[PDB]
Design a binder for these strands. Structure first.
Ligand SMILES: Nc1ncnc2c1ncn2[C@@H]1O[C@H](COP(=O)(O)OP(=O)(O)O)[C@@H](O)[C@H]1O
Ligand SMILES: [Mg+2]
Length: 434
DNA sequence: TTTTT
């Protein structure tokens, strides 16, 4: 509906050039424009996103769940990690007929995921000569929002010598196709609070005086119990503690879903709580996709019935009831063996638990992309990722709806240099690799 | 530290 939305819709549908990017600050309407691209490209297009919450918000699915990529480092063009589907599988028949791939929240898309989408699309359509196999890809997202996640294994050494960085614009595909950049400026999520919107405009460039304005405006440590509030917190275990304190305020019998952890599985890598106490009405979020498709990762809901090795959840999207059973997680580490310059994956331990965690309080990574009614930001040991603070402050429409526990220190205004070179070289309208 | 199955 917006002008820059309508002009970005046209610049993307009216030209047959693949590799477009529609970027802009948070709440400018990228994902809403995607809903319009979906109506334009009905049935011709698949909508993907890197995260489960962002995928549901965009009315699509995660990139891994579509291509069936393993949840590990997708080595460059490596047939052990990236594998094309079967000769007459229904996945194959979807890649072949499709012509548009809409990829939302492109900023959280790690370079190895994008480079795997390229190769996977080349091999299945057997156009190994053409980027993305001839699919017209439409990227949407923001690079000043959260960076892609890199675990401290040899994966970070593999990424740093094959791409030199984890961001999607460091993928080697951009040396074969130029990326066309369309920009949105005027904010729509915060169209009601213009000064909140422009406070957030100067915060995304890191204006320090625009931050002391924030610390005296929106600090209400008591902000965590006004009903209708969603608590954002950086670290997962911090969210566990806040979740349980709200959980003890419900008049139901609790169930303790003890996890069967095994092998060398660290506690810091725990997807959900190990003990995971849950009551008959708790607000949960689902962490794994249903092999039958009635629920997905990132699905918010509330418990209705819970039992020994299963429980039922009312999903908030469709208002329907699902029953979840314990999925099994597994930890992958990358070992340098043999004394050859090739690393190889290994599984060192499993974590069998019900794919559920409480969601009175959520991480910030699972909040990116969402429009929330009311948010309280509880800073634990602090901010550790790039764009993590900007994401937590932009989920609301009015400042009135945002709450801080402590005043932010400029200490927490992280920033990557790879992003500034990108944001500077796309001022021309194009990105082809340096 | 955080995501993805
Ligand atoms: N043209 C528009 N008119 C009215 N509201 C809009 C418009 N575009 C977006 N919005 C609203 O702004 C909110 C944020 O939009 P969203 O698509 O999330 O932007 P982004 O994906 O860039 O964060 C949504 O709740 C939506 O209703
Ligand atoms: Mg969005």
């Amino acid at each position: 509906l917006s002008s820059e939305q309508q002009r970005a819709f046209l610049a993307v549908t009216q030209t047959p050039h693949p590799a477009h990017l529609i970027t802009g600050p948070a709440g400018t309407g990228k994902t809403t424009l995607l809903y319009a691209l979906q109506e334009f490209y009905k049935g011709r297009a698949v909508t993907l996103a890197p995260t489960g919450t962002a995928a549901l918000q965009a009315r699509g699915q995660t990139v891994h769940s579509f291509f069936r990529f393993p949840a590990r480092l997708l080595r460059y063009r490596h047939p052990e990690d990236i594998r094309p589907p079967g000769p007459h599988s229904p996945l194959r028949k979807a890649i072949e007929q499709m012509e548009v791939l809409i990829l939302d929240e492109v900023g959280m898309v790690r370079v190895d995921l994008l480079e795997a989408m390229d190769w996977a699309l080349r091999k299945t359509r057997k156009r190994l000569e053409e980027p993305f196999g001839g699919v017209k890809v439409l990227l949407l997202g923001d690079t000043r929002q959260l960076e892609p996640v890199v675990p401290g294994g040899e994966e970070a050494l593999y990424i740093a010598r094959t791409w030199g960085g984890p961001f999607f614009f460091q993928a080697h595909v951009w040396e074969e196709v130029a990326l066309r950049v369309h920009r949105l400026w005027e904010s729509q999520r915060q169209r009601e609070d213009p000064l909140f919107a422009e406070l957030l405009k100067r915060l995304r460039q890191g204006d320090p005086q625009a931050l002391e304005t924030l610390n005296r405006a929106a600090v209400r440590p008591d902000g965590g119990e006004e009903p209708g509030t969603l608590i954002l917190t950086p670290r997962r275990k911090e969210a566990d503690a806040l979740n349980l304190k709200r959980l003890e305020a419900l008049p139901g019998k609790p169930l303790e879903y003890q996890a069967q952890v095994k092998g060398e599985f660290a506690e810091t890598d725990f997807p959900t709580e190990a003990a995971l106490t849950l009551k008959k009405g708790a607000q949960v979020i689902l962490l794994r996709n249903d092999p039958l498709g009635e629920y997905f990762n990132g699905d918010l809901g509330w418990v209705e019935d819970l039992e020994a090795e299963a429980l039922a959840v009312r999903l908030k999207r469709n208002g329907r009831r699902v029953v979840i059973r314990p999925f099994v997680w597994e930890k992958i580490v990358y070992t340098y063996d043999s004394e050859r310059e090739e690393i190889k994956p290994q599984v060192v331990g499993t974590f069998r638990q019900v794919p559920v965690r409480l969601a009175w309080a959520l991480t910030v990574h699972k909040a990116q992309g969402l429009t929330l009614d009311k948010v309280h930001l509880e800073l634990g040991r602090g901010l550790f990722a790039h764009g993590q603070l900007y994401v937590a402050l932009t989920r609301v429409r009015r400042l009135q709806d945002l709450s801080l526990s402590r005043p932010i220190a400029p200490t927490e205004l992280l920033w990557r240099p790879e992003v500034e070179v990108f944001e500077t070289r796309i001022q021309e309208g194009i990105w082809q690799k340096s």
